[PDB]
Amino acid sequence: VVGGEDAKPGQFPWQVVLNGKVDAFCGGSIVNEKWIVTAAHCVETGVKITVVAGEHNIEETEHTEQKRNVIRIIPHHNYNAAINKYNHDIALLELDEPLVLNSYVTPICIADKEYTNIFLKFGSGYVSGWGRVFHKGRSALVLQYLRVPLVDRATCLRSTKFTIYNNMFCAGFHEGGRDSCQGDSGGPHVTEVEGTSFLTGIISWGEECAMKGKYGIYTKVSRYVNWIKEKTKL
Amino acid sequence: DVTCNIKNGRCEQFCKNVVCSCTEGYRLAENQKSCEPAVPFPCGRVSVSQ
Numbered sequence: 001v002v003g004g005e006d007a008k009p010g011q012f013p014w015q016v017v018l019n020g021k022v023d024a025f026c027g028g029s030i031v032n033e034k035w036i037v038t039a040a041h042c043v044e045t046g047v048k049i050t051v052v053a054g055e056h057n058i059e060e061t062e063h064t065e066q067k068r069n070v071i072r073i074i075p076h077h078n079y080n081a082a083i084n085k086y087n088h089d090i091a092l093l094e095l096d097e098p099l100v101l102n103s104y105v106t107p108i109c110i111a112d113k114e115y116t117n118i119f120l121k122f123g124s125g126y127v128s129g130w131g132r133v134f135h136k137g138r139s140a141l142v143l144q145y146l147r148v149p150l151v152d153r154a155t156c157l158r159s160t161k162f163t164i165y166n167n168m169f170c171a172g173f174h175e176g177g178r179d180s181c182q183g184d185s186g187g188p189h190v191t192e193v194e195g196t197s198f199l200t201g202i203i204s205w206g207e208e209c210a211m212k213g214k215y216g217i218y219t220k221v222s223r224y225v226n227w228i229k230e231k232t233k234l
Numbered sequence: 235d236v237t238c239n240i241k242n243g244r245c246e247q248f249c250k251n252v253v254c255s256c257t258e259g260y261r262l263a264e265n266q267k268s269c270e271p272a273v274p275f276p277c278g279r280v281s282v283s284q
């Protein structure tokens with residue numbers, strides 16, 4: 001996250017970090033004790049991944065962390081990286097052993113299709129992750145967060161030569177300076193509804209991080225609610 | 235008089251034409267509008283001191 005702030009411990013207890021050949025390459029959100037929702041481009045190669053819940057400072061042991069191996073990767077059936085690496089960009093990860101829910105490890109709420117869309121249209125979500133804090137720069141040690149406004153589809157379409165499909169959305173600032181970045185993808189975009197946060201998007205992709213005239217592209221979670229609830233049933 | 239089209243029928247979370255409801259881990263309050271924790275760690279809540 002470029003232009004964000006250090007989260008306090010337990011401020012985003014649904015956030016998880018993904019590790020593989022490179023640690024902190026992508027983020028995710030806790031659906032429940034056995035399941036994580038992330039971007040399919042983060043796990044498309046089907047490589048051995050580990051999830052860390054309860055993380056705050058990735059280089060300091062705070063005794064709140066919970067690491068788990070991933071035993072199953074379910075990309076959405078409409079995801080195909082050979083056609084478009086960032087369309088239908090959502091995947092679920094099954095953990096080898098359940099997380100122990102506490103104040104540092106808590107799931108994110110997911111409303112039905114209609115209400116997830118209503119909450120996105122409130123126009124202001126929180127994004128978070130351990131990604132790059134500058135475009136082409138060092139990645140964060142402490143979890144970063146940022147409030148990003150929703151951008152109308154017309155402004156979003158004029159900002160890029162790439163195709164922004166109807167179940168993708170734009171968020172960020174007209175003048176740049178603050179945005180999500182590489183290392184944050186798969187992480188959450190949440191909307192606070194009277195003190196309860198609901199998942200409204202997945203951090204997906206963008207061109208230059210925090211550049212004036214460019215915005216972050218997110219996956220609309222409302223498009224996949226029935227698939228998340230179905231596959232993650234305990 | 236009361237409809238989900240105006241202020242969500244005054245429901246804190248979900249409204250159905252009104253009957254208010256909440257997401258899993260929350261229970262409908264004595265006022266029939268607000269949502270309260272029904273489990274120790276309900277989804278989407280910050281419980282560490284800030």
Ligand SMILES: N=C(N)c1ccc2[nH]c(-c3n[nH]c(-c4ccccc4)c3O)nc2c1
Pocket residue numbers: 025026041042179180181182183184185203204205206207208209210215216217
């Ligand atoms: N401009 C932005 N707001 C932005 C947001 C998310 C991004 N994600 C990426 C990204 N670049 N490369 C990968 C990646 C991650 C895992 C495997 C392969 C590629 C990414 O997730 N660039 C990004 C830029």
Ligand code: NA
Pocket residue numbers: 055056057058059060061062065
């Ligand atoms: Na740590």
